[PDB]
Ligand binder design. Structure first.
Ligand code: WTA
Ligand code: CAC
Ligand code: CAC
Ligand code: CAC
Ligand code: CL
Ligand code: CL
Ligand code: CL
Ligand code: CL
Ligand code: CL
Ligand code: CL
Ligand code: CL
Length: 653
């Protein structure tokens, strides 16, 4: 009864078919004939300077430590370029087709960027990187940009010449930006003078200057290219253009890449330690991101697509730039926020550009729900037919609101589960063919074999089951390693021979539908952003008066999960609102606003530790959630902390 059937119109329009059988027939084929399946997709849908030698052997891999090093290769011996598949090959047939319907935060700032215009922008920038900054195949380029056309231009210019990009979310502090540039050893930083988020100025160049001063004090010598959106080492993009020759505006050769040449680095939070650079290569990621974009959203050439994610996250890589452009999509590119000038903004964009596919996140949805349906009903949503959710679980009422108010009830919802490490969608509905259970990711994508591993015995559980979500077989979009640390990669994701461990928990029901329960490690999902507890603790501890801290998640009604901080101060410290405010500001300096603690509790007699000195985080998880029952607390070094924490927490309410 908790099932919503797809719309008949989406069934008639589906690339797959009108019935679930149409999807299952394809899926079983993608599993029984994995090589042939991906060989047909890659050959039908992409351009190759050179094709893999044998369609029988389009992949090789090892998911078992005990047999040797973990590895995965797709389309070995193939040669291609991501920029060529995203731009050049669409020309001249789709020269005048709109790539990005761009709007700034200021609604009077708009720009309809065609694929032809993207080409000019990319070759110009690519020639600047080549002949003015000496960017070569393999060189790392950092991006610190807002959601403007230049951000996609920069990712494709680097891809055109073989450069490895690393995108730093424009909301990260200077220290956060500095750390990522150093670890990637970037030759160049591309940024913009500033951006806007409502009425708040986002001066990006000034932050970047603080990051660069820090890198230069550490020995580095990083160049900076600055686009004018609203100066040492620092060159304005206009000055660089003025140095280009007329032919350098027209033409730039494509650097043809091998299947496993690196495409980008993306720093991702983990259960322990600082964020690590996840490494994605060329051929496999290209095929998987574009193929998932096509089927998970049933994109057709007459659709208009709008993803609200930032390029600084994997969602923006795969489903704002790389994926959509490779399938010659017409997309909306929005620099601003959903509540400026008011909360109708996204719906004004939907009718203005006749959007038919909208890809957003539960946190944004729940924010829109707090503002009133009237902010939605003033815009025309008759063109919407597919709605997408990503980043974290979506509750039933939010799912129903999205489809019924947002989509006027004539939409299919694709709640897609996946990760930075998976490259693209892994469990997702497909419009027209997949029955929907509100809150469920439903069925695995073509060529994906998920499993539920028993938490204690680490065996696969048949039929309905709850446990650890794992992937028992490789897929083209899988991350290949961690930058300069394959051992950490093997330990983190392949501790169970034969499986990729996702770090999520999930339940599978009697129809084979998957329900993702959230992280099972020390990783938080705060406002759809992935953040680790260890790095928040390290930031909290940098405050001169903080001795020790412990960070746990706890339930929140908009962000899903909030950040709860237990901390002890230096002796003789007067705890005041200002002090606690200065500690919040310390996290925002070290990391950024996305990691702002929500609650800060003083462990008045200390943090709960075992006799051996290990913090008992389960006790902190239970206290922050108000569960005072499931706590033996006598193995503690100081058992009296429990009543201190329960009391101080109730005093805070
Ligand atoms: C794409 C973002 O990738 P990341 O930023 O690397 O976060 C990845 C992490 O977000 C969570 N997650 C993502 N999608 C969903 C979903 N549909 N339902 C429930 N949880 C989800 C999950 O915990 C995962 O492991
Ligand atoms: C190796 As085959 C032809 O069964 O995909
Ligand atoms: C993706 As089509 C060729 O059916 O518009
Ligand atoms: C929630 As976002 C627009 O920073 O991906
Ligand atoms: Cl059906
Ligand atoms: Cl059928
Ligand atoms: Cl196989
Ligand atoms: Cl080889
Ligand atoms: Cl069930
Ligand atoms: Cl803020
Ligand atoms: Cl102690």
């Amino acid at each position: 009864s908790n099932v919503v059937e797809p719309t008949e119109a989406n069934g008639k329009k589906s690339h797959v078919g009108p019935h679930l059988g149409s999807r299952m027939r394809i899926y079983e084929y993608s599993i029984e004939h994995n090589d042939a399946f991906w060989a047909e997709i890659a050959r039908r849908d992409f351009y190759w300077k050179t094709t893999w030698p044998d369609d029988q052997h389009v992949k090789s891999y090892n998911f078992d430590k005990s047999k040797g090093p973990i590895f995965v290769k797709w389309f070995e011996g193939a040669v291609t370029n991501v920029c060529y598949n995203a731009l050049d090959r669409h020309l001249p047939a789709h020269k005048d087709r709109v790539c990005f319907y761009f709007e700034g935060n200021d609604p009077s700032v708009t720009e309809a960027v065609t694929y032809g215009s993207m080409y000019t922008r990319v070759v110009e920038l690519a020639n600047v990187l080549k002949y003015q900054y000496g960017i070569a195949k393999g060189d790392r380029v950092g991006l610190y940009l807002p959601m403007i056309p230049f951000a996609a231009v920069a990712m494709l210019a680097c891809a055109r010449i073989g450069a490895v990009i690393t995108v730093i979310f424009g909301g990260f502090s200077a220290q956060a930006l500095s750390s990522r540039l150093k670890d990637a050893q970037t030759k160049l930083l591309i940024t913009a003078d500033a951006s806007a988020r409502g009425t708040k100025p986002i001066p990006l160049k000034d932050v970047a200057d603080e990051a660069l001063k820090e890198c230069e004090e550490e020995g580095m010598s990083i160049a900076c290219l600055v686009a004018e959106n609203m100066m040492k080492r620092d060159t304005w993009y206009g000055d660089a253009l003025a140095r280009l020759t007329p032919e350098q505006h027209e033409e730039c050769p494509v650097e043809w890449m091998d299947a496993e040449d690196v495409l980008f680095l993306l720093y991702t939070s983990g259960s322990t330690g600082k964020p690590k650079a996840i490494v994605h290569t060329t051929a496999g990621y290209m095929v998987y991101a574009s193929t998932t974009f096509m089927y998970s959203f049933d994109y057709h050439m007459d659709d208009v697509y709008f993803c609200t994610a930032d390029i600084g996250w994997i969602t923006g890589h795969s489903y704002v730039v790389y994926g959509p452009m490779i399938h010659c999509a017409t997309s909306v590119l929005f620099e601003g926020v959903p509540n400026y000038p008011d909360y109708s903004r996204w719906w004004q964009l939907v009718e203005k550009y006749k959007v038919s596919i909208l890809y957003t996140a539960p946190t944004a949805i729940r924010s829109l729900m707090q503002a009133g349906d009237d902010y939605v009903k003033v815009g025309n949503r008759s063109t919407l037919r597919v709605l997408g959710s990503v980043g974290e679980p979506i509750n039933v009422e939010a799912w129903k609101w999205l489809r019924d108010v947002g989509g006027e009830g004539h939409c299919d919802v694709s709640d897609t589960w996946w990760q930075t490490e998976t490259g693209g969608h892994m469990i997702t509905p497909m419009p027209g063919c997949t029955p929907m259970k509100p809150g469920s990711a439903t069925l695995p994508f073509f060529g994906v074999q998920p499993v539920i591993l028993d938490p204690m015995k680490l065996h696969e559980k048949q039929g309905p089951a709850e446990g650890l979500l794992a992937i028992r077989a490789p897929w083209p979009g899988m991350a290949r390693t961690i930058y300069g640390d394959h051992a950490r990669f093997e330990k983190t994701y392949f501790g169970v021979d034969g499986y990729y461990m996702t770090g999520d928990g999930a339940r599978r029901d009697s129809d084979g539908y998957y329900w993702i329960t959230g992280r099972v490690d020390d990783v938080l999902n705060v406002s759809g952003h992935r953040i680790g507890t260890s790095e928040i603790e390290d930031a909290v501890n940098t405050h001169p008066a903080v001795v020790e801290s412990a960070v746990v998640g706890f339930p929140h009604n908009i962000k899903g999960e909030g950040i709860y901080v237990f901390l002890t101060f230096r002796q003789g410290t007067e705890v005041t609102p200002e002090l606690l405010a200065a500690v919040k500001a310390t996290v925002r300096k070290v990391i950024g606003p996305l990691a702002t603690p929500d609650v800060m509790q003083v462990a008045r007699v200390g943090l709960p530790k075992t006799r051996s000195g290990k913090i008992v985080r389960r006790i902190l998880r239970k206290v922050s959630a108000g569960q005072y029952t499931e706590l033996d607390t006598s193995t503690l070094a100081n058992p009296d902390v429990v009543e201190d924490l329960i009391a101080e927490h109730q005093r805070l309410c």
